[PDB]
Design an enzyme around this catalytic site. Sequence first.
Site, PDB file in Angstrom:
ATOM      1  N   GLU C 357       0.950  -1.119  -0.029  1.00  0.00           N
ATOM      2  CA  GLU C 357       0.094   0.431   0.209  1.00  0.00           C
ATOM      3  C   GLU C 357       1.066   1.130   0.084  1.00  0.00           C
ATOM      4  O   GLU C 357       0.328   2.681  -0.561  1.00  0.00           O
ATOM      5  CB  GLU C 357      -1.026   0.165   0.838  1.00  0.00           C
ATOM      6  CG  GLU C 357      -1.837  -1.505   1.176  1.00  0.00           C
ATOM      7  CD  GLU C 357      -3.041  -1.280   0.216  1.00  0.00           C
ATOM      8  OE1 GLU C 357      -3.379  -0.541  -0.179  1.00  0.00           O
ATOM      9  OE2 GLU C 357      -3.432  -2.495   0.044  1.00  0.00           O
ATOM     10  N   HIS C 487     -16.869  -6.476  -3.356  1.00  0.00           N
ATOM     11  CA  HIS C 487     -16.573  -5.752  -4.490  1.00  0.00           C
ATOM     12  C   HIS C 487     -18.187  -6.040  -5.029  1.00  0.00           C
ATOM     13  O   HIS C 487     -17.909  -5.609  -6.474  1.00  0.00           O
ATOM     14  CB  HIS C 487     -15.557  -6.832  -5.577  1.00  0.00           C
ATOM     15  CG  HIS C 487     -14.615  -6.584  -4.156  1.00  0.00           C
ATOM     16  ND1 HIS C 487     -14.554  -7.799  -3.280  1.00  0.00           N
ATOM     17  CD2 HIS C 487     -13.730  -5.883  -4.027  1.00  0.00           C
ATOM     18  CE1 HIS C 487     -12.783  -7.618  -1.967  1.00  0.00           C
ATOM     19  NE2 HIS C 487     -12.629  -6.968  -3.132  1.00  0.00           N
TER      20      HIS C 487
END
Lengths: 596, 596, 596
Positions: C357, C487
Site C-alpha cells: 500500500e 466487490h
Amino acid sequence: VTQEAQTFLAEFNVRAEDISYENSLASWNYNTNITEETARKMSEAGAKWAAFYEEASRNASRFSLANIQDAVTRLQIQSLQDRGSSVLSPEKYSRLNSVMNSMSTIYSTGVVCKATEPFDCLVLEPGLDDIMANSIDYHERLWAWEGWRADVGRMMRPLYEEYVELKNEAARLNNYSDYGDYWRANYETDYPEEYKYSRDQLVQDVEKTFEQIKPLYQHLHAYVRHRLEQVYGSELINPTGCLPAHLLGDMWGRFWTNLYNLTVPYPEKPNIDVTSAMAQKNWDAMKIFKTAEAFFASIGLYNMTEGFWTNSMLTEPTDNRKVVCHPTAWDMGKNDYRIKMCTKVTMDDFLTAHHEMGHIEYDMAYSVQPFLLRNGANEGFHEAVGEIMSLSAATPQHLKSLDLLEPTFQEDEETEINFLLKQALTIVGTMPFTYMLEKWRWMVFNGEITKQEWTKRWWKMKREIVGVVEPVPHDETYCDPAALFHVANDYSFIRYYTRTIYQFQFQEALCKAANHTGPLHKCDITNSTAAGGNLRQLLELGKSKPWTQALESATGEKYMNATPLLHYFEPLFNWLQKNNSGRSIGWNTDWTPYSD
Amino acid sequence: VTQEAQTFLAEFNVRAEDISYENSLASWNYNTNITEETARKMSEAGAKWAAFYEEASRNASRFSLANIQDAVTRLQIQSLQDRGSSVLSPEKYSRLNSVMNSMSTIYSTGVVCKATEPFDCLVLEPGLDDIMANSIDYHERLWAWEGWRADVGRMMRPLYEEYVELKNEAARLNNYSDYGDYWRANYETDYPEEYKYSRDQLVQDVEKTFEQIKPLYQHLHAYVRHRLEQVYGSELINPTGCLPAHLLGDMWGRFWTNLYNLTVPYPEKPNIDVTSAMAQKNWDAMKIFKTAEAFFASIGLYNMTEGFWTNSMLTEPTDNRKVVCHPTAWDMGKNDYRIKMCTKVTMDDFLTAHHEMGHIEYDMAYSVQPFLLRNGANEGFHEAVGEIMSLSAATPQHLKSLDLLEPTFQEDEETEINFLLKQALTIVGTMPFTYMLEKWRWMVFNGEITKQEWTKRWWKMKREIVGVVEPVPHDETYCDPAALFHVANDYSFIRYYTRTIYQFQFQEALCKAANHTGPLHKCDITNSTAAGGNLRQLLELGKSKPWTQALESATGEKYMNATPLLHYFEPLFNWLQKNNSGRSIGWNTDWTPYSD
Amino acid sequence: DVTQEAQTFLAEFNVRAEDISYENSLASWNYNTNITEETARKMSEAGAKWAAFYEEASRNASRFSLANIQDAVTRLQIQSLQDRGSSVLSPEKYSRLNSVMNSMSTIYSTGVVCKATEPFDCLVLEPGLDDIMANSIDYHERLWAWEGWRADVGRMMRPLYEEYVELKNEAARLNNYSDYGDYWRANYETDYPEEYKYSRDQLVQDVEKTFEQIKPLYQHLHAYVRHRLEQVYGSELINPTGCLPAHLLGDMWGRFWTNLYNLTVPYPEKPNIDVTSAMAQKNWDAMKIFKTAEAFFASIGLYNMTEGFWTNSMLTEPTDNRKVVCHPTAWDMGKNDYRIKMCTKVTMDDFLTAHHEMGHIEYDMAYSVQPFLLRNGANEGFHEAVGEIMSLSAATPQHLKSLDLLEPTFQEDEETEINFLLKQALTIVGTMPFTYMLEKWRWMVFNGEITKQEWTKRWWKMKREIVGVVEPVPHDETYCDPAALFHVANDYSFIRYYTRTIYQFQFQEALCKAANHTGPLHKCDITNSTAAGGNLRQLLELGKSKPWTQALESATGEKYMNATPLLHYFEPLFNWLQKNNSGRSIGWNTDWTPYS
Ligand SMILES: *[C@@H]1O[C@H](CO[C@@H]2O[C@@H](C)[C@@H](O)[C@@H](O)[C@@H]2O)[C@@H](O[C@@H]2O[C@H](CO)[C@@H](O)[C@H](O)[C@H]2NC(C)=O)[C@H](O)[C@H]1NC(C)=O
Ligand SMILES: *[C@@H]1O[C@H](CO[C@@H]2O[C@@H](C)[C@@H](O)[C@@H](O)[C@@H]2O)[C@@H](O[C@@H]2O[C@H](CO)[C@@H](O)[C@H](O)[C@H]2NC(C)=O)[C@H](O)[C@H]1NC(C)=O
Ligand SMILES: *[C@@H]1O[C@H](CO[C@@H]2O[C@@H](C)[C@@H](O)[C@@H](O)[C@@H]2O)[C@@H](O[C@@H]2O[C@H](CO)[C@@H](O)[C@H](O)[C@H]2NC(C)=O)[C@H](O)[C@H]1NC(C)=O
Ligand SMILES: *[C@@H]1O[C@H](CO)[C@@H](O[C@@H]2O[C@H](CO)[C@@H](O)[C@H](O)[C@H]2NC(C)=O)[C@H](O)[C@H]1NC(C)=O
Ligand SMILES: *[C@@H]1O[C@H](CO)[C@@H](O[C@@H]2O[C@H](CO)[C@@H](O)[C@H](O)[C@H]2NC(C)=O)[C@H](O)[C@H]1NC(C)=O
Ligand SMILES: *[C@@H]1O[C@H](CO)[C@@H](O[C@@H]2O[C@H](CO)[C@@H](O)[C@H](O)[C@H]2NC(C)=O)[C@H](O)[C@H]1NC(C)=O
Ligand SMILES: *[C@@H]1O[C@H](CO)[C@@H](O)[C@H](O)[C@H]1NC(C)=O
Ligand SMILES: *[C@@H]1O[C@H](CO)[C@@H](O)[C@H](O)[C@H]1NC(C)=O
Ligand SMILES: *[C@@H]1O[C@H](CO)[C@@H](O)[C@H](O)[C@H]1NC(C)=O
Ligand SMILES: *[C@@H]1O[C@H](CO)[C@@H](O)[C@H](O)[C@H]1NC(C)=O
C-alpha cells in the site's frame, strides 16, 4: 607465359584460401561474439587479406591476357588483376579509408531526439526502424525520417563528395570511366563472342526491363496511393501525385511490405501464416532447417555438412553474447559452410531458412571450381538462387505437404490476391526504388549530375521514376542517398534489381522442367530431381562461364528478361487494373506536401 | 478374494499367453523377414497384445494385494496391476507414442555428411560406427561424434522433453514419484519379509558398489590415457585430465573394447586364435551351437528342444530376405524357444552362441512357473546368467578340451594380462559409463536436473564420475543422452550395471561349488554337476521369489557385492598399480580440448 | 481542427476539477477516519458537487471529434473525460441506481447470522463470521456461517441485484457499450498508438488463454489441499475425486485459501516464517514497519514519504477516537496529498501490506508529473500489480533475514522454500480461478448469456467447472450468492486481481533481470538495486500517457499478459506437487455434491 600464369595461380590460391579462411574465421568470431578483441582480431585479419590481395594483384598484373591459352586461367588471372582501390597512393588510399570508415560509423551510431520531456535520443535500429514500420502518425513518421536525413544525412555530404572523388579517381586508373563503370563490369561476360555482354548493355537492359515492369508498378502505386488516403486523409495524399517517402513502410521506402496491413485486398479472409501451426506442434529451429534440408534433398540437392550443423549459429546464443542477427550465409571456405541467424519459430524465418540454405547449396555446388571462380555467375545470381526456394516453399500445396496447413485452406481468389499483393509490395515496389537509387549513383559517378544538382536530381529522379515525393524540401546540405546503409558502406545496389528479374527466369525454367500446369505463383519445384538437375548444372559453375551462358542453359535465354516476373504477377496485374478503374494510373511531378 | 483373484488369473493366463504368442510370432516374422507385410502384421499383433493387457491390467487393479494370502498369486496380481503409458488419457497416449515413434525412427535414419566433395551421407548402422571402432584420426572421430550429436542429439531434444513430461505423468498416475521410481520397481522385493529391498536402496547400493570399483576403474582409466597419448599425442590428451569422449572406440565410449589394439599390454605375445582353429577344423554354425548344448549338459542341465533346432535362425539366411542380425534369444511362449543370430565362425560368436543359449536354458528352467512369473528374478539376472557361461567357455581349459587350443598352450602372465585387460575394456570401462547415464535420467525424472541445465549437468557428470571430457562445447540445444539407442528407444539401462556385478557373484558361487581353486578367471564349470544343481534351483525360481532370496540361495550373499568382480580382475589391478607408478590415477575435471 | 479548442477546454476543466475532487477526497477521508452523521452529510455534498461537475463537463466534451485531435496525449484526456459514465441516464434512473446501490452496500455491511440455541445471539463479518471461516474446522459450524451469509444477506440482495444490472446496462448502451461488462472491459482497451492496440474482446480471450496456462498448476494445488482436507474432515465429507465443499476454503468465499496453510503445511516440523513474533520481541510499532517499507523503496531508488503523508495518514486504529474504515487503502487525495488508511498491527501480513500500500503511493507520487486526467495506472491490474511486486521482494526469507526478522542461522533448505512457496500458492494460485470464474459469470450475466432464471443455476455450474468447488447446500433463484462478496455488492470490477497477479510476475522477472539475480525466481529481492528501481521509475512515471501494452513492453519486454513468469516463480512447488500427488487424482468430478 601460360606456364607461369598457372604457376603463380597455383601459388596464390594456396596462401589465399588459407589467409582469407583466417578472415572468415575472425569475422565469424566477431559477428557471433561482439566484443573489442573480436573487433581488433577482425580488422587484424581483414588487413592481412587486404595487403596479400594488394600485392598479389600487382604480381598478377604482370601477366598479359593476350598470351594466356586457357579460358580458365585468363578468367582467374583477369579477376585477380583488378587492383580495385590499391591503385591509388597510400596517402590518398587511406584518406578514402578514413572517409569511408567515418561514413560507416556515422550511419551505425546515428540518433534523432524527441522534442519534449527528457529529450530522448533514438537510434535507427530499431527505434527509428520501428516507427517507420508500424506508425501511422504522419508527423511522427516524418519526425524520424527528416531527422535521420537532416542530422546523419547532413553528416554525410562532404564525406561522400570526397568518396566520389577518390573512388572515381582510383577507378579511372583501372581503365574504367567512372566508379559506376567499375561496378557495371560485374556484368561483363566479354570473352565468348556468342556470349559477349558489355558494361553499357547492363544500363540498357536495366532500364529496358524496368519499362516492361513499370506498368504493373504503376497500378501498385495507384492502389497503395488510394488506401494510403483512407489512413492519412485527403489533405495529406494528393490522389494523383507522388507518394511521400515517410509513408512507405520502412525508413526509405526500399520495401513496401509493412504497408500490407493498410493495403490488404480482402481483409475479411485469413492468411497463410503457419507460425500458428508450426508452433502448435512443439517445433524448433532445427526442424525448420531440417525441413529446409529435405526440400533441397528432395530436389536431389546437397545435404548439410556436419560442420554446418555444428559451426552455424542457427539460433540466438541465449544470453550474454551479442549477435548481428541479420540472416547471412557464409562460404567461409576450406569446406566451411555456416549460416548466421537468430532464428525464430515463424513463417518468415521458415522461408528465410530456405533462402539461406540455398546460398550454401550454391556455395557447395561450385566448391569444385578453382578458388577464384567460386562465386555466383554475376552478383544478382546468388540472390535469385536463394529466393526461388522461398517461392516454392511458401506455396500452399507445399505447406499442405509439410502438414503446416489443413486441406481446408481454400484457394479463394481472395487469399490468392492477398498473397500476391504482399509479394508485389515487397518484390515489385523495390524495383523502381532500387533502379533509381543506383541510377543516381551511376549518374553522379558519370558527372551527369554535377555536385550542385545532387539533392535536386535525386528528388527529381525520385518523383519521376519512383512515384515518391519529399514531404519537406532539402537543399545541398543533405545527402539523402547516404541515408541508406549500402550507399554509405560502399555497396552496389543494382544486384537487388537483377536478383528479382533472374529469380523469375529461374522459377519458370524450373517449373517448366516439372510439367507445371498453370499459375506460376502456385509452383513448387520439390521432388523435381529434373529441375534440381538444371539447378545443379548452373550452381556448380560459379563464375566459370559467362552469366549469359548459364542463364540460357538453365532457362533458354541469354539475357535479362522481365517477362517471367510479369507472369508470376499477372493475376494481380489483372486485379489492380480492375480495382483502380476510376483512379488515374500514374503520378504528378508538381505536387508536393509543401505545395498542397 | 484370494479365490476370485485366482479365478481371474485363471482366465488371464490362458487368454494372455495365447495372444502374446501371436505377437512373438509376428515380431519374429518381422525379424527373420524384413518386408512391409511383416512390419504391419507385427504392429497389428502389438495392438491386440497392448489392448488386452490394458483391460487385464485394469481388472487386476480392481484387486487388493494385502487381501491376497498367496505370495504367489499376490505377486502375479501385482505385476499385472502395473500399466504405464496406458494410465495416460486417450489423447496423451498418442502424444507419447508419436513422441517416441519419431525419436526411434530419428535414430534409425540418422546420417552425417562430409564436405570433402560429393557430400556423402553416412548412417550409424554400418558406417559412422566403423569410424568409431576402427579409427585413429582425432578429426574424423570428431567428425562423426560431434556430427552425430549436432544432427540427431539436437533432433531429439524437444522430443525427449515431451516424453519426459508425459512419462513422469504416467509413473505418477501409477503411484510412483517419477519415471525413475517406476523403473526401479523391478528391484523391489518388498513383499516377502527378511528379503525386503526398497527401490531407493538400489540407488544407494549401485553407488556403494560403484565406489568399490572406482580404484580399478581409475587405474584402467589412467593406463589407457597413457596408451592414448602415444597414439594421438600430448597436445590432444591431457596426461592429468579427462579423456575426450570421441577417442574411446565406439560411438559413445560405452565399451572400450575396440581400444585394445591401442592399449594391449604385451603386443608381442599371441592371442587366443581359435577362429582359424575353428576355420581349419571345418567348423560351422551348427557345430558351435552343438558344442554349446554339450556344455549346458555337462553342468548337468538340459539339451535343446526340437523347436530350437527348426524354428531358430542360426545362420544368416543370405540376403534373399532381410534380417535383424543382432543376436537375441526369444522365449516365444507356449513352449517355443528360438535364437535369432547371424552366427559366423568367430571366437566371439562362439562365445555369443554360449551366452545366448544361456538365456534359453534360464527361459526353460522357470517354464514350470506361471506365465506372469516366467521371467528372471530381476532385469540384471538374465543378462548375467548368459555371461557366466561365456566366462567359462573361453578359458583355455575349455578351449584345449575342444581341441581348439594346442595340447600344450602356455598361460604365462603376459597372455593372462592381455586377456584380462581386453576383458576389462569390455567389462570395466562400461560400469562407469552405465552408472552415470542412468544417474542422469534418474535425476531428470526425479527433477534434480532441470531443463536449463540438462546438458551442463550431463557433461559435468561425464567428467567427475567417468573421467571423460567433451571435444566440442555443447549447449542446451543438444540432448546427448538420446544420441544413444537405449535412451531414445525408452529402455532402462542400469541392468547392464546390475548384470556385471551379478555375473561375478554367480561365477564365484559356481567356482566354489565346482571346487575351483585359484584364479577366478581360469575357472570352468563344465562337467560340473554341483554347479548346475545350484544354478538350476535358482533358474526355476523365475520371479517367484525375491531376487534377494534367489541371489542368497545360490551365492550366499543376498545383496549386490562388487567384490567377486574385484576378484576376477585382481591380476590386472596389481599390474595397473605397478604400470601406472609413473602416471597419476585421477583426472582434472576442468581441462577440455577447447580451453587452450 | 479542434486540438486547440480542446486544449483550452481542458486547462479550464483541470483547474476547477483538481479543485473540486480534492474537496471530494477530503470530505471522504474525513468520513472514513471519523464516521458520524455530519461526516456522512459532507461526504455526500462533496460527492454530488463532483457528480455535477462531471455530468456538466462530460457534456461539454461530448462535442469534440477525437479524430480531429493531433496529440495522442491531449486526445487521451478528452477521450476519458467524454464518458458520462452512469450520468447518461435520467434524473429518475440515476437516483434509482444510486439508491439501489446504497441499500446493497448497507445490507453487506450490517448483515448478521444468528445462532439457534440460547439467547439467539447474532454474528457479523469483520470480527465474527470471518474468524469462524478463518479458524474453524468444525464442519457444521462453518456450514452455519457460510449458509447463513447467503440466506440472510445474499437473498436480501437478489432483487436489488437484478434491478442494478438492468440499470447499469442501460447506462452501458447509452455510452456506446454493449453491456456493462463491456463498459468495464474498457480499461484494457488501448488503441491510440497503432503499434500498441488492444480490444475488449482480446481481454476475454487472453484471460482464458492464460488461465489454461495455469490450470495444471492450480489443479495440483487443488489436488493437494483436498487430500489434506480429507485428513481432517475424513472421507465421507471430502470426496477424494470431487470438488471441495465451499465453506472449507479459508474465508467466506474462498477468495483466498491462505488460512488453510495450517491444514496443508508441506513440512510441519520446520521453523515457521511468521515474523510476527520477532517483531514482538524487537518491539516494533507500525512506524517501524512503514519506515522499513519506505527505506525499501528508498533502497531501490524510489521516493521517501512526503510530510503530508506522515502527518495526515492514519496508519494506526484511532485509540479513543470514533469509528473507522480499517481496510488498507492508499489515497491519492489530490493537490500533492498522499496518504494511507490502515489499522495496522505488529503482524507480518500488515508488514507486507505496508509495502503493497506504500506502492500505490509510490505510483501516485511518480505519475504526479502527469496531467490530472492521466494520473492512473495504465489499467486496473497495473496498480495492484506494482504493490504486489513490492510484497514479493519483501516476503522472501532472505529479505526477512536481512532485517533481522529471521535468525542469522536460518537454514534456507528446500523444505522451508517449498513450505514458503506453498503458502504463496494458497494466497495467489488459489484466487485466480476464483476471480476468473466470478468475473466470467458477471460478464455473462450482463451479456445475457446467463438469463435471470439461471443466475444461481449457472453460478454453481461454473464453480464446479472452473474452480473445483461445490455448494454444500442446494440454492435456487431466490439466492444471489455472488452478491455476498464485497466487490459484488459495491459494484467493483474483479478481473483486476487476475490481471494484477499476472503482471506482477512479468514485472518481477524483468526487474530481477536488471537486478543481477539468478536462480529460482521465488528467491529474488530487489533491494539496493538502483538499477531495478530506475526501470521501475520509468514505468511508474507514465501513468496513462502511453498504452499499457506499450508500458509492459518497455518494462518486461512483452506487450501482452503472460502466465509464464508466474509459472517460473511457482515451478518448484509445481514439481513438488506432482510427486506428492501420486496415488491421487489431478481434477474433480462435477457431479458429486455433499447432499447428492
Ligand atoms: C540426404 O540425407 C538423407 C538422410 O538424411 C535425412 O535426415 C533427416 C532430416 C530425415 O529427413 C531422414 O528422412 C533422412 O534419413 C539420405 O537418405 C538416406 O540415405 C542413407 C544412406 O545413403 C540410407 O541408408 C537411408 O535409407 C536414406 N533414408 C531414407 C529415408 O531413405 C540421402 O541420400 C541424402 N542425400 C544427399 C544428396 O546427401
Ligand atoms: C543330451 O543328448 C545326449 C545325446 O545327444 C548328444 O547329441 C550330440 C550333441 C553328441 O555330441 C552327444 O553329446 C550326444 O549324441 C544324451 O545322451 C545320450 O543318452 C542316451 C539315452 O539316454 C544314452 O544311451 C547315450 O549313451 C547318451 N550319449 C552320451 C554321449 O552320453 C543326453 O541324455 C541328453 N541330455 C539331456 C539333459 O537330455
Ligand atoms: C530518503 O531518506 C534518506 C535518509 O533516510 C534516513 O536515514 C535512513 C537511515 C533511513 O532510516 C530513513 O528512514 C531515514 O529517515 C536519504 O539519505 C540521505 O540523503 C542525503 C542526501 O542524499 C545525505 O546527505 C544523507 O547522508 C543520507 N542519509 C543517510 C543516513 O545516508 C535519501 O536520499 C532519501 N531518498 C530519497 C529522497 O529518494
Ligand atoms: C517375406 O514376407 C513377404 C511379405 O510378407 C512374403 O511374401 C508374401 O508371400 C505370400 C505367399 O508366398 C504372398 O501371397 C504374398 O502376396 C507375399 N507378399 C509380398 C508383399 O510379397 C515372403 O514370402 C516372405 N519371405 C520368406 C522367405 O518367407
Ligand atoms: C473384467 O471384469 C469384467 C466384469 O466382470 C468383465 O466384463 C465382461 O466381460 C465379458 C467377456 O469379456 C463380456 O461379455 C461382458 O460384456 C463384460 N461385462 C462387463 C459388465 O464388463 C471383463 O471381461 C473382465 N476383463 C478381464 C480382462 O478379465
Ligand atoms: C585389431 O587388430 C586386428 C589385427 O590387426 C584386427 O583383426 C581383423 O578383424 C577383422 C574383423 O574383426 C577380421 O575380419 C580380420 O580377419 C582380422 N585380421 C586379422 C589379421 O586377424 C582388428 O580388426 C583390429 N580391431 C580394431 C578395432 O581395429
Ligand atoms: C568472446 O570474446 C571475449 C573477448 O574477446 C572472450 O573473453 C570470450 O571468452 C569470447 N566468448 C566466446 C568466443 O564464446
Ligand atoms: C468527528 O466528527 C464530529 C462531527 O462531524 C466532530 O464534531 C468531531 O470533532 C470529529 N472528530 C475528528 C477527530 O475529526
Ligand atoms: C460547461 O459549459 C458551461 C457553459 O458555458 C460553462 O459555464 C461550464 O463552466 C462548463 N463546465 C465545465 C467545463 O466543466
Ligand atoms: C501410494 O502408494 C503407497 C504404497 O502403499 C501408499 O503408502 C501411498 O499412501 C499411496 N498414495 C496414494 C495417494 O494413494
